[PDB]
Amino acid sequence: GELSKDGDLIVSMRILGKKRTKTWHKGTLIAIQTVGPGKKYKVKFDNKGKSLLSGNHIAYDYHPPDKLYVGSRVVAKYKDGNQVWLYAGIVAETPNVKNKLRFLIFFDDGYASYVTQSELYPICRPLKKTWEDIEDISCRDFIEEYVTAYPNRPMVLLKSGQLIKTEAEGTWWKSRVEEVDGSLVRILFLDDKRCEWIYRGSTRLEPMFSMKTSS
């Protein structure tokens, strides 16, 4: 079942591939094979290794041109402090005034951040329902609900200095709003002193949880 091409996927192209670590890495597409129900894509990584991958586990090595939309399946730069990885997610918001022309990404592990146009890459063959390859069931469920409800996004209006409870790991914690950036809020957990950027429509934020529990 060997192919030299599949539409715009051509043997020899540059590509990103998902490693068993779930991080993504640069490489070359060296083969295309039909195996049972679909195609598999053989990637030789630049640094080390080879993998045989489904089409939702490869991404183009170019940045999207208004091509992407809410629900788009992407690989993006996941920056948390001074650590950076390429990791899969979903486009939650496209560039606009309120967000200073950035993309909001909801990553497959539950992380959220804004990224620039030059920090994301379109997955080559996403699933029709783009969330159906998210492994973590809580994340998968959340994204299905979010994408389906879009553009109805209930959010809480929060101000710097405001004190609220924020959930983490099953506990509701005293916290403080440090900063607002578009649809994200930087929450300081007051017992720990760590910060987290959280979506203003997340029911981890007390005012958002309370609204939903009553509604």
Partner 1 sequence: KSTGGKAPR
Scanning residues 97 to 136, which ones bind partner 1 (CB under 8 A)?
A: 106-107, 109-112
Give yes or no for a contact between 16 and 26, defined as CB atoms under 8 angstroms apart. Answer: yes
Report the residue number, 64 or 110, with the smaller CB distance to partner 1.
110
Q: Cis link prior to 151 (omega < 30° from 0)?
A: yes
Please tell me whether residue 180 binds partner 1 under the rule CB under 8 A: no
Please tell me whether residue 203 binds partner 1 under the rule CB under 8 A: yes
Please tell me whether residue 175 binds partner 1 under the rule CB under 8 A: no
Q: Among 170, 193, 214, 215, which residue sits at the site for partner 1 (rule: CB under 8 A)?
A: 170
Report the residue number, 54 or 203, with the smaller CB distance to partner 1.
203
Report the residue number, 16 or 208, with the smaller CB distance to partner 1.
208
CA atoms within 13 A on the CB side of 125: 14
Please tell me whether residue 199 binds partner 1 under the rule CB under 8 A: yes
SS (H, E, C) 23-69: CEEEEEEEEEEEECCEEEEEEEECCCCEEEECHHHEEECCCCCCCCC
Please tell me whether residue 73 binds partner 1 under the rule CB under 8 A: no
Positions touching partner 1 (CB under 8 A) are 80, 106-107, 109-112, 138-139, 142, 146, 167-170, 194, 196, 198-199, 202-204, 209
